[PDB]
Design a protein around this ligand. Structure first.
Ligand SMILES: CCCCCCCCCCCCCCCCCC(=O)OC[C@H](COP(=O)([O-])OCC(O)COP(=O)([O-])OC[C@@H](COC(=O)CCCCCCCCCCCCCCCCC)OC(=O)CCCCCCCCCCCCCCCCC)OC(=O)CCCCCCCCCCCCCCCCC
Ligand SMILES: CCCCCCCCCCCCCCCCCC(=O)OC[C@H](COP(=O)(O)OC[C@H](N)C(=O)O)OC(=O)CCCCCCCCCCCCCCCCC
Ligand SMILES: CCCCCCCCCCCCCCCCCC(=O)OC[C@H](COP(=O)([O-])OCC[N+](C)(C)C)OC(=O)CCCCCCCCCCCCCCCCC
Ligand SMILES: CCCCCCCCCCCCCCCCCC(=O)OC[C@H](COP(=O)(O)OCCN)OC(=O)CCCCCCCCCCCCCCCCC
Ligand SMILES: CCCCCCCCCCCCCCCCCC(=O)OC[C@H](COP(=O)(O)OCCN)OC(=O)CCCCCCCCCCCCCCCCC
Ligand SMILES: CCCCCCCCCCCCCCCCCC(=O)OC[C@H](COP(=O)(O)OCCN)OC(=O)CCCCCCCCCCCCCCCCC
Ligand SMILES: CCCCCCCCCCCCCCCCCC(=O)OC[C@H](COP(=O)(O)O)OC(=O)CCCCCCCCCCCCCCCCC
Ligand SMILES: CCCCCCCCCCCCCCCCCC(=O)OC[C@H](COP(=O)(O)O)OC(=O)CCCCCCCCCCCCCCCCC
Ligand SMILES: CCCCCCCCCCCCCCCCCC(=O)OC[C@H](COP(=O)(O)O)OC(=O)CCCCCCCCCCCCCCCCC
Ligand SMILES: CCCCCCCCCCCCCCCCCC(=O)OC[C@H](COP(=O)(O)O)OC(=O)CCCCCCCCCCCCCCCCC
Ligand SMILES: CCCCCCCCCCCCCCCCCC(=O)OC[C@H](COP(=O)(O)O)OC(=O)CCCCCCCCCCCCCCCCC
Ligand code: SF4
Ligand code: SF4
Ligand code: SF4
Ligand SMILES: [Ca+2]
Lengths: 159, 124, 148, 195, 410, 342
C-alpha cells in the first residue's frame, strides 16, 4: 500500500527529477581539449624514442634484447661494426601498427636506449608514416629528451 | 573579418566561450617561444594553454608538456628543464604536409632507396 | 571569391556535424566510449553517435578486424551515404597489431575500406582518439570539397 | 473561390475512391482511402458542416491505420506480382447514368421547408446546434447507438479472443511490488565454504 | 522447450501453422547493432516480436589467441590475457600468473599479493560500472552510463599511475607485480573510495525503484538452480539465483581470507536480482580496496617480484652485478622454464569464473593454453533464456549475462 | 495603401505574410530547440554538450542542417519509392500545419475556427502516418517492426486523449482555442488557470504528449537498443532531416497545447505584469524543458506496457474524471470553479 501510494503520486519520477536537477547545477569535470589535457604519470607508455648519452653518443649497442622480448615482433634490427669499431645498429625499425605499447622493450633494454615517451598525439594520414626507422626514432629522442630524462628520474626508485 | 573568425570557428586559438572562461578564471602562468600562453585555476588544479594561431595540440613543446599534463607540479618558468646541447627543437605533427616522415623506400620520397643484399658480377 | 568560400562553409558544416556510426569491435571501443563520456565529451564538438549507417558520416574502426567480420564492416561502410570518412583506431585496425600473424585476422583495415586517419596505440587513449578526430577535421578543411 | 475549392476536393475524393478499388497494392489502397476521407471532409467544411468534417477525419485516421495493421498481418505471399471487368464497368456506367438523370430534375417537395425537425440557425455555431438536438430530440437514437457499439465490443471479443499459453508473461503490478530489500541479501561466507 | 508452433489457451490450430515453416521472420541482430557489442551476430526468429529462436553466431572477434600463444614465451604471452575480458584486464592476467606460479612452485611477496587484491577489486568495479550502466542504456536509460563512466575514468587513471597504461596494464607478472605503487597513489585511491558510495546511491536513486526499470527487469531472464547447472553458470549468474558461491571464499587465493566482505545473493534469479547483486558487489569491492590500502601502508617495505630464477632483477642491480645482468639477459630472451605438467587455475573474475588450462612441457613456451571464459558459457544459454520473451527484452538479457567478446571468441 | 490592403491581393498577401510569421517562429525556434534539448541532457550528464560550433555551440543546429543538405540521398533498391518520399513529407508538413490554429496572443492566430481542438487532433494523428508509412515503405525488417510499433503507439495514447481534455471543454463551453484561454482569465493570476481545477488531466495530458511525440519513456519507434534506428534506419540527408524536424515541431505543438489548455496561454501569472505573447513563449519553453529533462532521467517502456497504461490506467481515469467534472460543473460546486461558461 505504501509503495502503491508513492507510485500513484509519481514519487519515483519526482526523485529522479530532483536528482537530475542536482546534477544539472553541479560542476562539470569536462576537459576543454585541446587547451586542457588529461593527467599523465611518469610511467605513461607513449610514442617510442631512441635516446643518446649526455656525451651525445647513441645509447643503443645493438644487443637485440628489445627485438627478442617484443611480444608483437614489432622491432627489426641489423647491426655491423661501425667505422670506428663500435657496436651499433644500421637498421632499427619499429612497426607502430604491430606494436602493442606494452613497454617490454624499455624494460629489456640494458642501457635505456629505447623508451616509450610521453607523446601520444601523432596520428597520421597515411599508414606508412607509422613505420618508424632509426632516424625517426632518434629524432624523437632528441626532441623529447628533456621530458624523458625527467620521467626516468621520477620513476627510477621503482625500477 | 577578425571577429567573425572568432565567432564562427573553433580551431583558431580559442572559441569565444573559452576566452570568456579564461578571463573569468584564468591566471597567467607563462609563455612559450611560439607565443602560446599558459593559465591555471586553483593554483594548478586546472591548467590550460591559449594557442597563438591554429589550436593544434601537438604544438605544445616538451618544455611545457609535463606541466600541462600534470606530470610535474611546477611550471617551467619556476623549474626549467635541463637540456643537453645535442637536443633538437620541438616540431608539431607534420602528417598532412610535405615535411611528414616517410620510410626511405616510400614512393613519396621521389628517390626511393634501392635495396639489395648481394653484389652482382659485371661483365668486362 | 565564391567557390572556395562555398567549400569553406561546406567544410565548416561537415566538421561541426560529424556523426559517427555506433560501431566498436574490441577493446579499442572501450577508449572510444570514454571519449564520449563526461571527462572528454566528444559530443560537445558536434561529433555525435548514430546507430544507422544511413545517418553516419564517419566510421571509426575501433578494434581487431577478423576475416569473418570483414564482409560485415565493408557492407555497413558501403551503406554510408557520401561523403564518408574512416578513422583507423589502434594497432589491430592500423596493421593487425598483436594478432598480425594470425590465420583469422585482417592485417590492417585499409585492406577492406579506405582510411583517412590512423590513430596509434593499443588502445589509443581517449585523448589520443580525440586528437585523431581533430586531425581528420584539419584534413577536411585542407582538402574538403562538395564531393568530400 | 468556392468553385476552385469544390473541384479540388471533389476530384480528389472521386479519383481517390476509384484508386482504392482498382489498384492492386492493398497498402496503396489504404493511403488512397484516407485521401478520399480527407477530401470529403473538405467538402463538408465548404457546406458549413464543420463538426462532422473534423469528426470524420479524427475517426477514419485511426480506423484506416487499423486497416493497415490487418493488411500486413494477412499480407498475401505474392506481393511482388500483386475477372469480368468489362461487363462490370458497363453496369456501373448504367447505374451512374441513371442516378445522374434522376439528379438532373432534383427538386425538394414544396413542403420540405415547413417539415424541418431541426432548422439551422445562422447565429449558432454548427457544433452547438448539433448538441442542442442530438441528446434531447434524438435521445432514443443516441442510446441505441451505444448498444450498437456494445454489440461490436462483445462480438469482436467473442469471435477472436485467444492468448498464447507458451510465452513468458509478467504481472506489471507484481513487477512494481518487488522489494529490493527482500530480493537481495548479503551472506557471510566463511573461507573454504561451498554450497 | 519449443514454441515455434504457437499454442493457444483455446486450443485453436491455424491453417498456416499446419503447413511446414519455410518462410519465417529471421533477422540479423548485430554485429553492427547498439545492443550487440559490435561483434555478435544473433539470428532471431520472431513471431509477432516474440523470440522463438535465437542463434548466436560468434567468432567475429576470434583472433586465434590460443594458437598465437604457442609460439611465444610465458612472459610474451602475458599481454594476451589483458585482451580477453578487456574491460578488466589485470583480473585476467591473474589466472595466467597463478597457473605459472603453481607449476613452478613459486611464492610471491606479501606486498605483491596485497596489490593484486587491490587492483583486482578495482577491476571488479571497472567491470560492474560498465555492466550495470550500459545495461541501463540497453533498457533506454541514457544518463546512467555517463555518471558511471566518469567513475571508470578515475579508475583508469589509477591503472595508468601503476603501470603507464589506462587499459592493457601488463602489470601482474609471474612472481608478483611489475612495480610498486607510489605513496601518493595510495592516498588518491583512499580518497576515491570515500566518494564512490555516493555515486552508487545516485545510480540507485535513479534506477532501483523506478517503475519503468522494474518493468524492464523484474521477472525477466529467470534462472533456477537447475538451469545454472545446465549451462555452466558462474559468478553473479549463480549468485542471483541464491547460491552463495564465490571463488574468493569457496576456493581462496591470494590473501582474500583476511579481508572482510560479504557475498550478495538474489532470491528470484531474474535480471533485477542480478542488477542488485552487481550494485552490492560494487560496494563490497570498494570496502576491500579500503582495507588493502590500509594493509599496504601498514606493511614493511619489501619487493614486489619474487626475483630468483623467475623474474628479472632490479635495474640498478642489473647494471652492477654480473649475476643480475645474466639473469636479466636470459629472462628477457629465453624466460623461465616451466616444469612439465598441467594445471587449471581459476579466479573469480568480474564476469564469473575465468580460468587458464596450461599444459607445460618443461620448455620456455606453453604446449597448450586453453582459456576458459565465463561469457562463453553464459552466451550459449541465450537461446534457452530468451525463448518466449519479446524482442524488447533481448537487449536486457544480453546485458544481464555480462558478455565481452574478447573472451568469448579469444 | 488603404486602397491596396482591402483588395483580394492585399488580402492574399496578408495570409502569406501571416503564414511566413508562423513558419519563421516555428522554424526559428527549431534552431534553439535542438540545441536546448542537447544542452539539457548534457548538463544532467555532468558534461557540456555542444559548445564549440559558434559561441557556446549556438550555431550547432545550422551546421547539422547544412550537413544534411549536402549529404547524398540514398534510395533503397527495394523501397516503395513514392511512399518512401511521402512519409518524411507528411511528418514535417503536418506537424507544422497544426500551428495554423494555435493562438499566441489576443488576435494572433492565423485561423480562428470553432473546432480548433478537433482540428489539432485530426492533424496530429494524421502525422503518425509518416512514421507508419516511412517504416513500411523502406522494405527492411527494422523499419518494418517500427512501423507496427507506431500503429501500436497510436492505439495506446489516442484512446484516452479525447477524454483527457473533454473536461476543459466542459468548463469552457467551447472548442475554440482562444476561448479556452479567455476562460482562464481572472483576478488571481495563475490561480484562474485550468491546471488547478483539472490537476489530474495535466499529468495525463503531459504523459500522453510524450507518447504522441515518440519521446522517452515512449521512444519506441526508434528504440536504438532494440531497433537500430527504427522507422528511420533507411533514411539519409534531408528526408531524414524532415523526420527530425517533424519530431521537434510536434513536440513544440504539445508545448503550445499544454500552455494553452492548462496555463492560460498568453495570460500573465501575476496581475501587475501585462499579458502578451511573451507569456505564451515562456510557458512553451518551460514545457519543452520538461520534455528534455524527462529524456535525461527515464528508461524505456516495452510497447505492450505502454498499451497497458493507455487502456487500463489512463482510459478509466480520464473517463472517471469526465463524469466527475460534469457533476461538479452541472451543480456549480464551489461556485462554478469548474463551470467557467457564461
Ligand atoms: C464512471 C466511472 C468509470 C471509471 C472506471 C471504468 C470501469 C473499469 C472497471 C473494470 C475493471 C475490471 O474489470 O477489473 C476489476 C478488478 C478485477 O479485475 P481482474 O479481471 O481480476 O484483473 C485485475 C487487473 O488485471 C489488475 O490490474 P492491472 O494489472 O491490469 O493494472 C491496472 C491497475 C491500474 O488501476 C487504475 O489505474 C484503475 C483506477 C480506476 C479509475 C476509475 C475511477 C476514477 C475516478 C476519477 C478520479 C480522478 C483521477 C485522479 O488497476 C488495477 O489494479 C485493477 C483494479 C480495478 C479498477 C477499478 C476501478 O476488480 C474487481 O473485481 C472490481 C470490479 C468492479
Ligand atoms: C522558461 C525556462 C525554461 C528553460 C529555458 C529553455 C532551455 C534553453 C536551452 C539552453 C539550456 C542551457 C543549459 C545550461 C546548463 C549550464 C550548466 C549548469 O547548469 O550549471 C553548472 C555550471 C557549473 O559548472 P562549471 O561551468 O564547471 O562551473 C565552474 C565555475 N567555477 C562556475 O561556477 O561556473 O554552472 C554554470 O554553467 C553557470 C552558468 C549558467 C549559464 C546561465 C545561462 C543558461 C541559459 C538559460 C537560458 C534561459 C532561456
Ligand atoms: C502529485 C502527482 C500527481 C498525481 C495525479 C495523478 C496522476 C496519475 C498517473 C498515474 O498513476 O500513472 C502514471 C503513469 C503510468 O505508470 P504505471 O505503469 O505506474 O501505471 C500507473 C499505476 N499506478 C498508478 C497504480 C501505480 O506513468 C507513466 O506513464 C510514466 C510517466 C512518464 C514520465 C513522467 C515524468 C514526470 C517527471 C516530473 C516530476 C517532477 C517535476 C517537478
Ligand atoms: C548568449 C548566451 C550567453 C551565455 C554565456 C554566459 C556566460 C557564462 C560564463 C560561465 O562561467 O559559464 C559557465 C559555463 C561554461 O561553459 P563553456 O564555456 O561551455 O565551458 C568551458 C569550460 N572550460 O557556461 C555555460 O554553461 C553557458 C551556457 C550558455 C547557454 C546559453 C543558452 C542560450 C539560449 C538557449 C536557447 C533558448 C531558448 C529560447 C527560450 C525562450 C523563452 C525563455
Ligand atoms: C545566426 C545565423 C547563422 C548562419 C549560419 C552560420 C554558418 C555559415 C558560415 C560558416 C562559418 C564560417 C566558415 O565556414 O569558416 C571558414 C573560414 C575560416 O577561415 P580560416 O580558418 O582562416 O581558413 C581555414 C582554411 N582551411 O571562415 C572565416 O574565416 C570567417 C569568414 C566569414 C564567413 C561568413 C560566411 C559567408
Ligand atoms: C518571439 C517571437 C514572437 C512570438 C510570437 C509568434 C507569433 C507568430 C504567429 C503569428 C500569428 C498570426 O497569424 O498573426 C496574425 C495577427 C493579426 O492578423 P489579422 O489579419 O488581424 O487576424 C487574422 C484573422 N484570422 O498578426 C499580428 O498581429 C502580428 C503577428 C506577429 C508577427 C511577429 C512574429 C514573427 C516571427 C518571429 C520569428 C523569430 C522568432 C523565433 C526565434 C526563437 C524563439 C525562441
Ligand atoms: C544555475 C544554472 C541555471 C541555468 C538555467 C536553468 C534553467 C531552469 C529551467 C526552468 C526552471 C525549472 C525549475 C525546476 C524545479 C526545480 C527542482 C529542484 O530544484 O529540485 C530540488 C533539488 C533537489 O535535488 P537533490 O539534491 O537530489 O535532493 O534541488 C537541487 O538539488 C538543486 C537544484 C536547484 C535548481 C534551481 C535552478 C534551476 C536550474
Ligand atoms: C441523356 C438521356 C436523356 C436525358 C436528358 C437529360 C440530360 C441529363 C443527363 C444526366 C446524366 C449525366 C451525368 C451528369 C448529371 C448532370 C446534372 C445536371 O445537369 O444538373 C443540373 C446542374 C446545374 O446546376 P444548378 O443550376 O445549380 O442546378 O448541372 C451541373 O452543373 C452539375 C455539375 C455536376 C458536378 C460534377 C462534379 C464532378 C466531380 C469529379 C468527378 C471525377
Ligand atoms: C520573419 C517573417 C515576418 C512575417 C511578416 C510579419 C507580419 C505578420 C503578418 C501580419 O501582421 O499581417 C500582415 C499585415 C497586413 O497589413 P495591416 O492590416 O496594415 O497590418 O501587415 C502588413 O501589412 C505587413 C507589415 C510587415 C512587413 C514585414 C515583411 C518582412
Ligand atoms: C503532396 C505530395 C508532395 C510530394 C510527396 C513525396 C512523394 C513524391 C516523390 C516520389 C519520387 C520518386 C522518385 C524515385 C526515383 O527513383 O527517383 C529518385 C530521384 C532521382 O535522383 P536525382 O536525379 O538526383 O533527383 O531522387 C530524388 O532526389 C527524388 C526526390 C523526390 C522529390 C519530391 C519529394
Ligand atoms: C482538483 C483540485 C481542486 C482544488 C480545490 C480548489 C478550490 C478553489 C475554489 C474556488 C472557489 C470560488 O470562489 O470559485 C469561483 C471563482 C471565480 O473567480 P473569477 O473567475 O476571478 O470571478 O473560481 C475561479 O475561477 C477562480 C478561483 C481562484 C481561487 C483558487 C484558490 C485555490 C488556493 C489553493 C491553491 C493550491
Ligand atoms: S612496446 Fe611492446 S610491442 Fe611495442 S615495440 Fe616495445 S616490446 Fe614490442
Ligand atoms: S634499444 Fe636497447 S635492447 Fe634494443 S638493441 Fe638497442 S641496446 Fe639492445
Ligand atoms: S589495438 Fe590494442 S586496445 Fe585496440 S582492439 Fe587491438 S588489442 Fe585492443
Ligand atoms: Ca510461431
Amino acid at each position: 500500500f505504501a509503495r502503491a501510494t508513492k507510485y500513484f503520486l509519481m514519487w519515483d519520477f519526482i526523485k529522479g527529477f530532483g536528482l537530475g536537477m542536482r546534477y544539472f547545477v553541479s560542476p562539470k569535470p569536462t576537459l576543454n581539449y585541446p587547451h586542457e589535457k588529461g593527467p599523465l604519470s611518469p610511467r605513461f607508455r607513449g610514442e617510442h624514442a631512441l635516446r643518446r648519452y649526455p656525451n651525445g653518443e647513441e645509447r643503443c649497442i645493438a644487443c637485440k634484447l628489445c627485438e627478442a622480448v617484443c611480444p608483437a615482433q614489432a622491432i627489426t634490427i641489423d647491426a655491423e661494426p661501425r667505422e670506428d669499431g663500435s657496436r651499433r645498429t644500421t637498421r632499427y625499425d619499429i612497426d607502430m601498427t604491430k606494436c602493442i605499447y606494452c613497454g617490454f622493450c624499455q624494460e629489456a633494454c640494458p642501457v635505456d636506449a629505447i623508451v616509450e615517451g610521453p607523446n601520444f598525439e601523432y596520428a597520421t594520414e597515411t599508414r606508412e608514416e607509422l613505420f618508424y626507422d632509426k632516424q625517426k626514432l632518434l629524432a624523437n629522442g632528441e626532441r623529447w629528451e628533456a621530458e624523458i630524462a625527467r620521467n626516468l628520474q621520477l620513476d627510477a626508485p621503482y625500477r | 573579418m577578425s571577429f567573425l573568425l572568432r565567432f564562427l570557428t573553433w580551431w583558431n586559438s580559442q572559441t569565444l566561450n573559452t576566452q570568456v572562461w579564461t578571463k573569468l578564471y584564468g591566471e597567467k602562468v607563462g609563455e612559450d617561444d611560439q607565443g602560446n600562453v599558459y593559465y591555471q585555476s586553483g593554483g594548478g588544479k586546472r591548467r590550460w594553454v591559449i594557442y597563438n594561431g591554429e589550436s593544434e595540440a601537438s604544438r605544445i613543446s616538451p618544455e611545457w608538456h609535463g606541466w600541462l599534463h600534470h606530470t610535474y607540479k611546477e611550471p617551467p618558468t619556476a623549474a626549467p628543464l635541463a637540456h643537453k646541447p645535442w637536443e633538437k627543437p620541438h616540431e608539431p605533427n607534420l602528417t598532412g604536409s610535405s615535411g611528414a616522415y616517410h620510410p626511405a623506400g616510400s614512393l613519396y620520397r621521389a628517390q626511393p632507396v634501392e635495396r639489395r643484399d648481394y653484389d652482382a658480377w659485371q661483365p668486362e | 571569391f565564391l567557390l572556395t568560400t562555398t567549400e569553406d562553409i561546406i567544410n565548416w558544416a561537415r566538421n561541426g556535424s560529424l556523426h559517427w556510426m555506433t560501431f566498436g569491435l574490441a577493446c579499442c571501443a572501450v577508449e572510444m566510449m570514454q571519449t564520449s563520456m563526461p571527462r572528454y565529451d566528444l559530443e560537445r564538438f558536434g561529433t555525435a553517435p548514430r546507430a544507422s549507417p544511413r545517418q553516419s558520416d564517419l566510421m571509426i574502426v575501433a578494434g581487431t578486424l577478423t576475416n569473418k567480420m570483414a564482409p560485415a564492416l565493408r557492407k555497413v561502410y558501403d551503406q554510408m551515404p557520401e561523403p564518408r570518412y574512416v578513422i583507423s583506431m589502434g594497432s589491430c585496425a592500423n596493421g593487425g597489431g598483436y594478432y598480425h600473424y594470425s590465420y583469422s585476422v585482417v592485417r590492417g583495415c585499409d585492406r577492406i575500406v579506405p582510411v583517412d586517419i590512423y590513430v596509434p596505440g593499443c588502445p589509443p587513449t581517449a585523448e589520443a582518439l580525440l586528437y585523431g578526430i581533430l586531425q581528420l577535421q584539419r584534413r577536411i578543411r585542407r582538402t574538403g570539397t562538395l564531393v568530400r | 473561390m468556392m468553385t476552385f475549392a469544390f473541384y479540388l476536393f471533389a476530384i480528389s475524393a472521386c479519383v481517390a475512391g476509384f484508386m482504392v478499388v482498382i489498384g492492386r497494392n492493398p497498402v496503396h489502397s489504404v493511403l488512397w482511402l484516407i485521401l478520399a476521407f480527407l477530401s470529403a471532409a473538405g467538402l463538408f467544411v465548404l457546406q458549413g458542416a464543420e463538426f462532422v468534417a473534423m469528426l470524420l477525419v479524427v475517426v477514419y485516421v485511426g480506423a484506416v491505420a487499423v486497416l493497415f495493421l490487418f493488411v500486413v498481418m494477412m499480407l498475401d505471399v505474392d506481393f511482388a506480382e500483386l475477372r469480368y471487368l468489362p461487363l462490370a464497368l458497363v453496369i456501373g456506367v448504367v447505374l451512374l447514368a441513371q442516378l445522374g438523370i434522376a439528379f438532373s430534375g432534383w427538386t425538394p417537395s414544396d413542403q420540405a421547408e415547413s417539415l424541418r425537425a431541426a432548422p439551422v440557425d445562422a447565429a449558432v455555431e454548427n457544433t452547438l446546434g448539433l448538441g442542442l438536438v442530438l441528446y434531447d430530440r434524438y435521445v432514443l437514437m443516441f442510446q441505441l447507438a451505444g448498444l450498437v457499439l456494445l454489440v461490436a465490443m462483445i462480438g469482436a471479443i467473442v469471435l477472436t479472443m485467444r492468448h498464447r499459453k507458451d510465452v513468458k508473461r509478467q504481472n506489471v503490478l507484481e513487477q512494481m511490488w518487488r522489494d529490493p530489500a527482500k530480493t537481495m541479501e548479503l551472506k557471510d561466507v566463511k573461507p573454504g565454504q561451498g554450497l | 522447450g519449443d514454441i515455434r508452433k504457437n499454442s493457444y489457451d483455446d486450443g485453436s490450430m491455424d491453417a498456416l501453422t499446419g503447413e511446414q515453416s519455410i518462410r519465417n521472420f529471421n533477422i540479423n541482430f548485430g554485429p553492427q547493432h547498439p545492443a550487440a557489442h559490435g561483434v555478435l551476430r544473433m539470428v532471431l526468429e520472431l513471431d509477432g516480436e516474440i523470440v522463438e529462436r535465437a542463434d548466436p553466431h560468434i567468432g567475429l572477434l576470434h583472433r586465434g589467441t590460443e594458437k598465437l600463444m604457442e609460439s611465444r614465451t610465458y612472459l610474451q604471452n602475458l599481454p594476451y590475457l589483458d585482451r580477453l575480458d578487456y574491460v578488466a584486464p589485470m583480473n585476467q592476467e591473474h589466472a595466467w600468473c597463478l597457473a605459472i606460479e603453481r607449476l613452478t612452485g613459486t611464492v610471491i611477496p606479501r606486498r605483491a599479493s596485497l596489490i593484486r587484491v587491490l587492483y583486482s577489486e578495482i577491476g571488479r568495479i571497472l567491470n560492474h560500472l560498465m555492466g550495470v550502466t550500459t545495461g541501463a542504456m540497453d533498457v533506454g536509460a541514457l544518463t546512467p552510463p555517463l555518471w558511471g563512466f566518469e567513475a571508470r575514468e578515475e579508475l583508469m587513471i589509477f591503472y595508468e599511475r601503476a603501470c603507464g597504461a589506462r587499459l592493457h596494464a601488463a602489470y601482474f607478472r609471474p612472481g608478483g607485480v611489475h612495480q610498486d605503487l607510489p605513496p601518493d597513489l595510495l592516498d588518491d585511491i583512499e580518497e576515491w573510495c570515500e566518494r564512490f558510495p555516493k555515486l552508487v546511491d545516485d545510480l540507485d536513486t535513479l534506477l532501483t525503484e523506478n517503475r519503468i526499470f522494474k518493468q524492464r527487469l523484474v521477472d525477466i531472464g529467470i534462472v533456477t538452480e537447475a538451469d545454472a547447472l545446465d549451462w555452466g553458470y558462474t559468478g553473479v549468474m549463480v549468485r542471483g539465483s541464491g547460491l552463495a558461491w564465490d571463488l574468493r571464499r569457496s576456493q581462496p587465493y591470494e590473501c582474500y581470507d583476511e579481508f572482510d566482505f560479504q557475498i550478495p545473493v538474489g532470491r528470484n534469479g531474474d535480471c533485477y536480482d542480478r542488477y542488485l547483486c552487481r550494485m552490492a558487489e560494487m560496494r563490497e569491492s570498494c570496502k576491500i580496496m579500503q582495507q588493502a590500502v590500509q594493509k599496504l601502508r601498514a606493511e614493511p617495505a619489501g619487493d614486489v617480484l619474487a626475483r630468483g630464477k623467475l623474474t628479472p632483477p632490479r635495474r640498478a642491480e642489473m647494471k652492477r652485478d654480473m649475476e643480475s645482468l645474466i639473469h636479466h639477459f636470459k629472462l628477457y630472451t629465453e624466460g623461465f622454464k616451466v616444469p612439465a605438467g598441467e594445471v587449471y587455475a581459476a579466479v573469480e573474475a568480474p564476469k564469473g569464473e575465468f580460468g587458464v588450462y596450461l599444459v607445460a612441457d618443461g620448455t620456455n613456451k606453453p604446449w597448450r593454453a586453453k582459456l576458459r571464459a565465463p561469457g562463453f558459457a553464459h552466451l550459449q544459454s541465450i537461446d534457452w533464456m530468451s525463448r518466449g520473451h519479446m524482442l524488447a527484452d533481448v537487449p536486457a538479457i544480453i546485458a544481464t549475462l555480462d558478455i565481452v567478446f574478447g573472451e568469448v571468441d579469444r | 495603401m488603404a486602397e491596396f490592403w482591402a483588395s483580394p491581393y492585399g488580402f492574399a498577401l496578408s495570409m502569406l505574410l501571416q503564414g511566413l510569421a508562423v513558419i519563421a517562429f516555428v522554424m526559428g525556434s527549431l534552431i534553439f530547440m535542438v540545441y536546448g534539448d542537447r544542452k539539457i541532457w548534457a548538463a544532467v550528464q555532468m558534461r557540456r554538450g555542444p559548445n564549440v560550433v559558434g559561441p557556446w555551440g549556438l550555431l550547432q543546429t545550422f551546421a547539422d542542417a547544412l550537413k544534411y543538405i549536402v549529404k547524398e540521398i540514398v534510395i533503397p533498391a527495394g523501397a516503395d519509392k513514392f511512399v518512401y518520399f511521402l512519409a518524411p513529407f507528411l511528418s514535417m508538413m503536418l506537424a507544422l500545419f497544426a500551428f495554423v490554429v494555435i493562438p499566441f496572443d489576443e488576435g494572433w492566430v492565423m485561423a480562428n475556427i470553432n473546432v480548433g481542438i478537433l482540428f489539432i487532433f485530426a492533424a496530429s494523428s494524421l502525422e503518425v502516418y509518416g512514421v507508419i508509412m516511412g517504416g513500411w515503405a523502406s522494405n527492411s525488417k527494422y523499419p518494418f517492426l517500427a512501423s507496427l510499433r507506431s500503429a501500436a503507439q497510436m492505439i495506446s495514447y489516442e484512446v484516452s486523449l479525447g477524454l483527457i481534455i473533454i473536461g476543459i471543454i466542459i468548463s469552457t463551453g467551447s472548442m475554440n482555442l482562444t476561448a479556452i484561454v479567455e476562460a482562464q482569465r481572472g483576478d488571481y493570476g495563475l490561480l484562474n488557470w485550468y491546471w488547478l481545477p483539472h490537476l489530474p488531466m495535466v499529468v495525463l495530458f503531459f504523459v500522453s504528449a510524450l507518447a504522441e511525440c515518440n519521446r522517452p519513456p515512449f521512444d519506441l519507434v526508434e528504440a536504438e537498443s532494440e531497433l537500430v534506428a527504427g522507422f528511420m534506419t533507411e533514411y539519409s540527408s534531408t528526408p531524414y532531416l524532415l523526420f527530425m524536424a517533424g519530431e521537434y515541431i510536434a513536440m513544440y505543438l504539445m508545448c503550445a497545447l499544454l500552455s494553452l489548455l492548462f496555463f492560460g496561454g498568453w495570460l500573465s501569472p501575476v496581475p501587475f505584469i501585462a499579458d502578451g505573447w511573451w507569456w505564451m513563449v515562456i510557458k512553451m519553453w518551460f514545457w519543452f524543458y520538461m520534455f528534455a529533462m524527462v529524456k535525461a532521467i527515464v528508461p524505456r517502456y516495452r510497447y505492450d506496457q505502454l498499451m497497458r497504461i493507455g487502456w487500463k490506467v489512463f482510459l478509466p481515469l480520464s473517463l472517471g474524471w469526465v463524469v466527475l467534472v460534469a457533476i461538479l460543473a452541472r451543480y456549480e460546486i464551489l461556485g462554478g470553479f469548474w463551470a467557467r461558461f457564461a
